From a paper:
The complex was formed in the presence of the GTP analog 5’-guanylyl imidodiphosphate (GNP). Three-dimensional (3D) classification resulted in nine major classes with varying tilt angle, indicative of conformational plasticity. The two protomers of [name] in the [name]ΔNC complex are related to each other by a two-fold symmetry. The dimeric interface mainly constitutes helix H9 and has a total buried surface area of ~3000 Å2. The catalytic residues, Asp244, Asp257, and Lys259, are located close to the dimeric interface and aligned along the FA interface of [name].
Furthermore, upon binding of the endonuclease [name], a higher oligomeric form—tetradecamers of 12 [name] and 2 [name] protomers—is formed. GTP hydrolysis by [name] bound to a recognition sequence powers DNA translocation, and convergence of two such complexes on the DNA results in nucleolytic cleavage. Here we present the structure of the [name]+ domain of [name] in complex with [name] at 3.6 Å resolution using cryo-electron microscopy (cryo-EM), which reveals the coupling between the endonuclease and the motor and the mechanism of activation of the [name].
Residue numbers in the entry:
A (entry chain M): 3 to 21, 28 to 267, 272 to 348
B (entry chain A), C (entry chain B), D (entry chain C): 168 to 457
E (entry chain D): 174 to 457
F (entry chain E): 173 to 457
């Protein structure tokens, strides 16, 4: 049952979310890492100042505040008991974004398997935010916040809040929670990998242009021009440069972690992407298969059907900088 | 008031309008629930003349709800004079009184954008009377502002209530409790994949292949939106009324006419929808232009 | 008045201007969405004289929505008189009555920064009536604060409405999808690329190299701005208004003037725009000066 | 009034002041952004008399914004005279009427802590009007509470607006970028390492070594603060006012005097700026004293 | 200066700081005599025990600018503009310039201090006091009528350090206020001398300080969660012994279970064992 | 009354020890504890004279406001007049009688916002600041001629309940000014058993049932987070229905098991009916 050290995933999640010292914490497991980011992350915000959104308030008060609503006043006859219905803007920190932080912290404490200090420190924070009201979180709450009015820093911790709630399962007790075994499932780990690269390549490969490209089948059918039944095909990433184009397909498989047979079923998808894609520039066409391995990294090249294709691996579990060096080394070879 | 004049132009299947008329005679409190641009407001004006069987304005009344709408204006309330406060019979009160005179003749009250105001704030006491079973003088009640208990108001059985609600907003996930019990919801489809919508297009000098190509896209695009539930539900999907408009001149449908519609209405709407994924906007916009 | 007079100084292409009148005359309600500094307020007063065909202010009305506009302000509301309250006809209601005095000559109502206010609250009844189809006596409606004697308020056909919603503040964006179908949205570009922008500068003693250098750098920046959508979307890209004004005295444009602009206005804007790393700020700031 | 009267006691360089007066004559709206304690309030009354050139306080109005401030108070709104309410022309409206009487003489409005109040809500109609090229009767606008379209309010050309906004709080920032365009943003620094600040200290019988040591100390500290722009930008850095006042008695600035103020004021500040690091607090606190 | 349990140096620091700066915040945990110091201190600064000059108020989250300075509120006939206390209070000192008038604000941390003060958040500074810096208020009908802080007025702020709110941090207000910490002062003889002048046992007093300080040190151990601001105050011991009940361990045992245990629970929340330990440690 | 009360006599003695000195107190316990009946007898106990006039009781709710509590403007036949509230009228009545202790009971205090209701007076009720010296002009007191001050004689008891898990940590305002006491249900006490043997109850029926609920009360409180010590069932359901004229019996309990404890048990757990059925079955026999 071999897996990646948990700390390294957080780096990939960071690029996945598109935006610190982790050596200090002694808990290797993820929630210890993830909570310490948040627990420190909240405190980092408070230094600068948390978001305060003017919420208009229409209420019945004994006097003039802001703009009086003449209609609701006369209709309810509130003048007679010395009151008016007036609209004014109380400034609160009770916004959806901040409510989510507080509700997330409640979930974090309730998790049964967690560092005690992490749980101790967070309980302070829950008390330190009296005005904010607890909420029962759903993805629909996060859906409303896709507008992204908030600052760039807020979006990072909220992304963490999205990860925690979805990857939280009740355990021994009804109240308490237990963390999901994220590493074991390939699909979510794989979907992380594909998104990890797409945002990563934009950062480092300033030389090349990095875009996801939709592809269209060359087919025509007398039955339907739509071709809906045909598989929808959208590249994982395309990283185009003037001298050479390159398509990459990346996936996480358990079989490859064992140093035997090889799982390369994804390759079957790849040629059709090369085929359906036709470049106006006509500089070259290349493909790459990249997978995660634990122990070591090996690079091969192939000349299959007039295409220059590479199968390669990365030794996750080594260290983040050499991994960062290794990736830049990787794309340097093929992007030429 | 012949059905042929009313229902031919309409894009909706004759199946659904029949069911609409069934429950409306039965329960008399009905809600048409659909996204904007499917003719919810359009059908409702015609349906009133269908049921009455004649074109008469007096027997049918129309209003749109909004936050300022209140009990005091809708039903009964006091309006200031130069100084004094005079009670005023409201619309719904005034409308029923006309309906009271003629119980046999069907009377219709049309309420657009009903979710914007809470029904309790406007209707209030009348939600007891409004229900289909608790109608008639047997259930008569004296009003909040009635000078004496003797004066009473009962919803005559003849009136039928239609409410037009759009499933386009995040707030409506918490549908008002009053609507669900007292009104009977009906869902209105966008209705692109219909012969009459196409037959309308073909009649205005339109190529069938260009029309049928369009229908595949709209049916395809709405499927993508409807698949989502978190951000955009099935109720958010595009209506069929962007395409109806603009043909009074006689200008034939084409990619030129279509391109104006997509760029000026549907493209920025998609920017608001698919904010998180800009490329998804490009993915569909280029698809639609083709 | 004619198109040649208005379009002398405008930096926007003719293409959109025809697109506006094409969409306007069929649909009668439009929105121009763009970042600040692209002449949204500037074009709007010019357009009104085109449709009327004459330079008349009477047929035009101009307002701004300030997040405190109300149905009492726009349409119908109650105001204190000396001792007691009275009902006051709002501004739009006041405008339409003049507009229906003559259907022949077109009347325009212009709303700057319309996106701010909760438009469902302001319009209320009007949200349905604004549409091109639902105009005239056929769709007459009685208002909330209308007298018990039936008196109805309908949008005249001659009226055309224009709104000017900036696209920078994301929160203040139209999410009333029912309302967003009433209007047609016209994206407006920054206006750098056009020669009509360039000729204005060359006419005002500008070097073509310095001019061509200026547009080259801005277009690079707006692409970097346009690339992101997480925080800074396509809409945030910088307008041309900064460069337009202040040269009337005879101050010729040079790197001194441009450097004053960069340090004083844009560079504060950039650090607020990015607020993640100064190096990106230091990069683009030096680029403009170079 | 004269220029040299101000510059005697002013720590800011003249170059920024020249930049200030050049922009302000052009743009007519500005915002001064820096940490607290650098004389934003100090300069603002001084600068007004420079721009007018005459020491007239009648023509200057100075206000401090806050959360409970609105368009009703600022511009126009309905307020109680007594038994009967009246429309009360706000402070800014009254100020503009005074300036209209004397177009030649410049009239100045100074807003302290502008960033707090919801400026979009407060200015509203003014948000468009204030622009330097849109002032005058041509752009006169009817207000929310105006009886008719004919009653219209226009900013005079003479008016100059000055904004004071601290950068210590990132929660409260003028993120409304359209509003950001109207104001030309002028950064201000604490200006420790200046002759004029030191000459004031030396005038107060101060050691040149202690003075030059003092300036060197903070300059390093501010740069350390500016480094961690993610955590603390340059806007958070320490102002000079802690050191300025308190010597009115004639007390010479010995090291003991510095040791007293640091312990009482700056010491807890560093604890808050560095909540996580106790050692870092000890480092810089001890560094100044030793 | 006799029954006060806080050092003469701190008050000596305060009086010079207050006289110079004119605004201060006395921040410390509950039960350290923040109120008694300020009430005593104002009488020192005036030099006479005159209560009309001194007015005290206790802020709370719902307090507003409407209440403090100006506001529209109803008379019998109708609504009018009602001058809040501080406007009324500053007028009182404005009537008599010579004497020093004092204004005390308790539970200051709870409210949005910016919101209430508003206009005076600039004016309160010692240099900008006078007609020159006067400003028209929010609700002022005309610009001509203005409000200016007088020079004689001094403000003292009393703040609970055990309920930090990570909602709004204002470092500009911190410029206005000169912050002074207050320690509980168990070690001080003046607190002990009061009790030894109440027929306490010498060992009973000395062992008590050892007991409380060890608890105080533990609270200050973890700076992030808790600090010197949270640690226990002394004032619980002052009251309840002036009836005539001389000190004894039984008397302390009442206070520990009566008063301190919820505080311990609040601080050492979801950790009963620590409560049982530190509760029981004191009793022995 | 002392023997009639089911709670420890020491707790009864303990409360007056606190209240006399502190002058402000709050009782937090499960519903069905007789918190109202406790305070009333205790209020009479401190006076010693069993006078209802001295004692006044109020039940709070979120709408409850400063105008209802203290002072506010109410419409006349025409216009409006200042209308003195409960606490304002109450204290001035006690102001006449300084020696006489007067009591004020605030039920369901945690529901409403203390700040909104009390306002100014929230400091004046703290025992240190009492009497004429700490006079404050009221919000609606237009003149400065008259000020409102609470005299020392006043004692304030607050009845709060730990029933609901929805309640988060209590408002900070309360904690400072109030002394919190936890009240046990009181099954074990002889005083409750002596109230059943006086009604000719079987000692086995008495001993079993006390063992029966106490066994439940331990398990409901065994849960750390969701159902705490504050949740556990009180004795009030057992009192009402025995001295009316109907003697104790297992069927009398059986009705009571169905009446309150069975639905209440669903509310607390609300997850497993079998767990409820087990406990409901266990109660019956
Ligand atoms: N000819 C024709 N026009 C239709 C049909 N369906 C809708 N329309 C047109 O679509 C336009 C708007 O219809 P409408 O009822 O207002 O949609 P709505 O549901 O009321 N919109 P909203 O939900 O935003 O209030 C009108 O021109 C209407 O006549 C149809 O079946 N045939
Ligand atoms: N001469 C000239 N000036 C232009 C042109 N376009 C914009 N401007 C100028 O840019 C300035 C602002 O234009 P404006 O219409 O107010 O832009 P806006 O979108 O309404 N501003 P905002 O979004 O901030 O409300 C004015 O000086 C305007 O005349 C143009 O094409 N020619
Ligand atoms: N003597 C003298 N004092 C100065 C000078 N510059 C600033 N100060 C002093 O610094 C203090 C504050 O001035 P102020 O404008 O209010 O600073 P601020 O940045 O506006 N503070 P805040 O933002 O908190 O309101 C006053 O003591 C002021 O006199 C100066 O050049 N000379
Ligand atoms: N003699 C004397 N009494 C004190 C001292 N400190 C506090 N007290 C008394 O303790 C009681 C309560 O003080 P209080 O202000 O409520 O505590 P705080 O507000 O939290 O500081 C009053 O009688 C105070 O005077 C002190 O240092 N000396
Ligand atoms: N006679 C008597 N009745 C008690 C005693 N304790 C509680 N009760 C009774 O229980 C009832 C009040 O219970 P209570 O918990 O206050 O009701 P709640 O407020 O709705 O929770 C009344 O019948 C009280 O008299 C007691 O010790 N003696
Ligand atoms: Mg409609
Ligand atoms: Mg504009
Ligand atoms: Mg200042």
């Amino acid at each position: 049952q071999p897996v990646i050290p948990v700390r390294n995933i957080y780096y990939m999640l960071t690029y996945a979310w598109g935006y610190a010292n982790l050596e200090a914490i002694p808990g290797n497991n993820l929630l210890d890492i993830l909570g310490y980011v948040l627990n420190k992350g909240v405190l980092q915000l408070s230094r600068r100042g948390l978001e305060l959104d003017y919420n208009p308030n229409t209420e019945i008060i004994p006097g003039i505040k802001g703009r009086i609503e003449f209609a609701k006043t006369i209709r309810g006859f509130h003048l007679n008991h010395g009151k008016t219905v007036s609209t004014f803007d109380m400034l609160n920190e009770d916004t959806l974004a901040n409510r989510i932080i507080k509700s997330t912290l409640a979930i974090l404490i309730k998790h049964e398997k967690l560092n005690s200090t992490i749980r101790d420190e967070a309980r302070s924070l829950y008390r330190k935010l009296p005005g904010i009201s607890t909420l029962h979180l759903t993805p629909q709450h996060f859906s409303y916040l896709n507008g992204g009015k908030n600052t760039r820093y807020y979006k990072f911790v909220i992304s963490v809040c999205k990860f925690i709630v979805n990857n939280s399962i009740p355990g021994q007790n009804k109240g308490h929670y237990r963390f999901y075994d994220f590493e074991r499932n390939e699909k979510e780990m794989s979907l992380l990998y594909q998104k990890f690269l797409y945002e990563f390549c934009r950062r480092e490969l300033t030389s090349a242009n990095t875009t996801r490209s939709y592809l269209k089948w060359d087919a025509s059918s007398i039955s339907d021009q739509s071709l809906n039944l045909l598989p929808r095909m959208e590249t994982d990433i395309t990283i185009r440069s003037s001298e050479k184009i390159l398509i990459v397909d990346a996936k996480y498989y358990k079989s490859i972690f064992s140093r035997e047979k090889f799982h390369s079923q994804n390759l079957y998808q790849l040629m059709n992407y090369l085929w359906s894609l036709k470049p106006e520039n006509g500089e070259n066409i290349g493909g790459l298969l990249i997978y995660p391995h634990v122990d070591t990294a090996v690079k091969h090249r192939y000349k299959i059907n007039g295409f220059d294709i590479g199968l390669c691996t990365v030794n996750l579990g080594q260290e983040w900088p050499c991994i960062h060096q290794e990736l830049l080394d990787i794309f340097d070879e093929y992007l030429k | 008031y012949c059905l042929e004049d009313a229902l031919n132009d309409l894009f909706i299947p004759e199946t659904t309008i029949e069911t609409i008329l069934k429950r409306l005679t039965i329960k008399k409190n009905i809600i048409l629930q659909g996204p904007p641009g499917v003719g919810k407001t359009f059908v409702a004006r015609r349906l009133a003349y269908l049921l009455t069987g004649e074109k008469a304005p007096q027997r049918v009344n129309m209003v749109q709800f909004h936050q300022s709408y209140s009990y005091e204006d809708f039903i009964q309330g006091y309006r200031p004079n130069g100084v004094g406060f005079r009670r005023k019979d409201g619309i719904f009160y005034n409308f029923c009184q006309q309906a009271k005179e003629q119980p046999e003749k069907k009377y219709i009250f049309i309420i657009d954008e009903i979710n914007r105001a809470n029904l309790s704030k406007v209707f209030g006491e009348v939600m007891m009377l409004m229900e289909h079973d608790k109608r008639g003088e047997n259930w008569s009640v004296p009003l909040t502002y009635s000078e004496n208990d003797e004066e009473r108001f009962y919803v005559p059985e003849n009136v039928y209530i239609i409410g037009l609600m759009n499933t386009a907003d995040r707030s409506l996930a918490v549908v008002d409790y009053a609507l669900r019990r007292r009104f009977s919801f009906i869902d209105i489809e966008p209705g692109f994949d219909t012969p009459q919508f196409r037959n309308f297009l073909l009649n205005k000098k339109a190529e069938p292949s260009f029309v049928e190509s369009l229908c595949q896209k709209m049916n395809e695009l709405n499927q993508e939106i409807s698949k989502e539930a978190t951000i955009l539900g099935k109720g958010f999907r595009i209506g069929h009324s962007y395409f109806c408009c603009g043909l009074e001149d006689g200008t034939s449908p084409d990619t030129q006419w279509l391109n104006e519609i997509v760029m000026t209405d549907i493209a920025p709407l998609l920017e608001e929808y698919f904010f998180d994924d800009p490329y998804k906007q490009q993915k569909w916009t280029n698809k639609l232009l083709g």
